[PDB]
Design a protein around this ligand. Structure first.
Ligand SMILES: Nc1ncnc2c1ncn2[C@@H]1O[C@H](COP(=O)(O)OP(=O)(O)O)[C@@H](O)[C@H]1O
Ligand SMILES: Nc1ncnc2c1ncn2[C@@H]1O[C@H](COP(=O)(O)OP(=O)(O)O)[C@@H](O)[C@H]1O
Lengths: 360, 346
């Protein structure tokens, strides 16, 4: 009668270490009266392991050193099965069935739809957004096109590809978008490859760096404003937390082992309640437009005139004991343990919904 | 020496299972046996993977109804994170010899919608066709249309129903917005699966309820009056468009249209292909109206691929034979995989 909850954390991605802490804190807060946890740790190589609750993290208390303890057991997944989908990769030995997955691998394979495709192929119910929404929210160019098309406010931008890169002069980009500009790879994370640009020198450098990381580079108008974030929860009836503020300054990737890169975070945002509600309602619209499920964190710019400009949507936000997404809910009447539970319930409901659908 | 191993993934838990069975047989039958060894990776209708043997993998192979995948002893499991021996015997862990490329030809639900591509991406397996986002986006007609309209391309005017808003609009409200007749389709599904033409209210409530048994979003569109033309696109970054073909009240290749129209449709296919981020191949299906407007209906990232299907017939009518189309798709897969590996991670 207790559901086995498989927490998938770690990963090849550069956010590996923040993933380890998100996992530690979920493991610590999860209602042990309803759920048994199984630790499904992914290596920096991308291989899956079943870790032991007592011995899974090597420097749990030390962000710049924390690590996932090596394992004998590697895992494989068996497509089309409905039980025992996860096995020992050396010998076929089955793991007991996991009833739901809680993926908390930030970035590269966990947030971009890839992991979600695998879990869908394994008939594993899972927390959060599915393939399309996850892939779409990770491609900044696509997400923005979807937002613009929904009528929502977005930084004016253009997208460079390998085949139009040189169509645009710096003058041309400057005439289109004004200065300063931000230049980023379409598919990254944690400001890696993001540069702000005030002249043609910078611009050309900016573009070359970003093309080291993706085949599409987004170049957008600089927005002046506070950075406000909001936590959305639900499937068909999305609810918005109160808003929170993040303060990033230009003075310092050299700290992508701390969530939000150690920026100043304050919850609730010291903004008026009617602005807070306005951002809340926009966050739900955004959520809807990107087809998100389970949860998402919506990050916006709030300009001097209280215009709200959507910057990012993150489908697997940081989930440490002091990360923005859970604190926002905690400030809104929903505690960590109960948040975790709600996320699991939503995952199982959506799975039931999907399963009931006809195939022919 | 030794040739590239091509794993053809086919079959699947999908309405289009039998079509996939055929696309695969034709691919197996035509692939250049001097360059490639095929490994047959058949997915039964329950969605489980097997290694099949090419001398005896289909039952009633020659009969378009009754064609079935022969049941197999070996079921398969995938090992995330490995760059070799990613596919193993799911009973005992024995690895298959490592496949060099995957040719996915599972039409519809999991094979065409990004799920399979996401699995292949995690297994570091090079693969033919469009990647995770593009496959998922082209399969969701609602998203594909919104992206096409954002690019300035013509699509059928539409509304999208969800379980929460489906009762907002009356037949009368829809009709004032979109005219009659209407087409009601699940957002995500293959070939005509829950699609209905609607001319009155009873038809509408019926059609909408039906599409909602196949998906959680339903597109309701204005019926477009025109000829149905298709175009095959091939490539990654500098893609090429075949000559066009037509479906008639019957497939006609080449479509009997002036050259200017052929080129207009062709250039639009490529724009649609770029807007949706497709890779390898797609078939772009359009309506050509009385005044030569081109309205995009569908972008298919894994189109029917029997040697008689539209996509291959369009290339043949443009000077590219079926064996050679197969080879070019495999080498585009490999070129894309190498370009993706050159991207830096830090
Ligand atoms: N258009 C913009 N105007 C102002 N600041 C921006 C703009 N784009 C990015 N930034 C700044 O750069 C940071 C990282 O950009 P973002 O697009 O969020 O990248 P990431 O996805 O890596 O978090 C933002 O949090 C913000 O401070
Ligand atoms: N909006 C429309 N206007 C006119 N005819 C349509 C429209 N939508 C669909 N049809 C007709 O119905 C057929 C099936 O719809 P389609 O979107 O092609 O479904 P599928 O993607 O499942 O093949 C089309 O090939 C076309 O003949």
């Amino acid at each position: 009668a207790k559901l086995r909850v498989g927490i998938v954390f770690g990963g090849k991605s550069a956010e590996h270490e923040v993933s380890l802490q998100s996992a530690k804190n979920i493991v610590d807060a999860i209602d042990k009266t309803r759920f048994d946890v199984v630790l499904l740790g992914i290596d920096k190589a991308g291989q899956w392991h079943v870790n032991d609750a007592e011995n899974y993290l090597q420097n749990a208390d030390d962000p710049a050193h924390i690590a996932l303890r090596p394992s004998a057991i590697s895992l494989a997944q068996v497509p089309g099965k409905h039980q025992h989908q996860l096995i020992n990769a050396q010998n076929g030995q089955p793991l007991p069935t996991v009833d739901v997955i809680f993926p908390i691998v930030h970035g590269t394979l966990g947030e971009d739809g890839s992991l979600q495709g695998m879990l869908r192929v394994a008939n594993l119910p899972f927390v959060g957004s599915d393939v399309l929404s996850s892939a779409a929210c990770m491609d900044k160019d696509v997400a923005k096109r979807l937002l613009r098309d929904a009528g929502l406010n977005i930084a004016p931008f253009i997208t460079l590809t390998r085949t139009n890169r040189h169509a645009f002069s710096f003058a041309e980009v400057e005439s289109r978008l004004g200065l300063p500009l931000f230049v980023k790879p379409a598919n990254q994370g944690s400001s890696v490859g993001v540069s702000k640009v005030a002249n043609e020198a910078q611009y050309q450098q900016a573009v070359a760096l970003a093309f080291e990381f993706d085949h599409k580079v987004v170049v957008e108008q600089g927005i002046k404003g506070r950075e406000i974030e909001c936590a959305v929860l639900g499937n068909d009836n999305p609810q918005a937390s109160t808003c929170g503020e993040i303060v990033l300054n230009s003075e310092f990737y050299d700290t992508k082992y701390i969530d939000d890169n150690g920026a100043q975070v304050v919850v609730p945002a010291q903004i008026p309640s009617e602005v807070n509600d306005k951002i809340r309602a926009i966050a739900i619209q955004a959520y809807q437009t990107l087809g998100c499920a389970g949860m998402a964190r919506v990050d916006v710019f709030l300009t001097a005139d209280n215009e709200v400009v959507i910057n990012e949507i993150n489908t697997l936000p940081g989930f440490t004991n002091i990360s923005m997404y859970p604190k926002l809910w905690q400030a809104s009447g929903l505690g960590y343990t109960d948040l975790i539970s709600r996320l699991i319930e939503l995952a199982l409901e959506r799975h039931t919904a999907n399963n009931a659908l006809k195939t022919t």
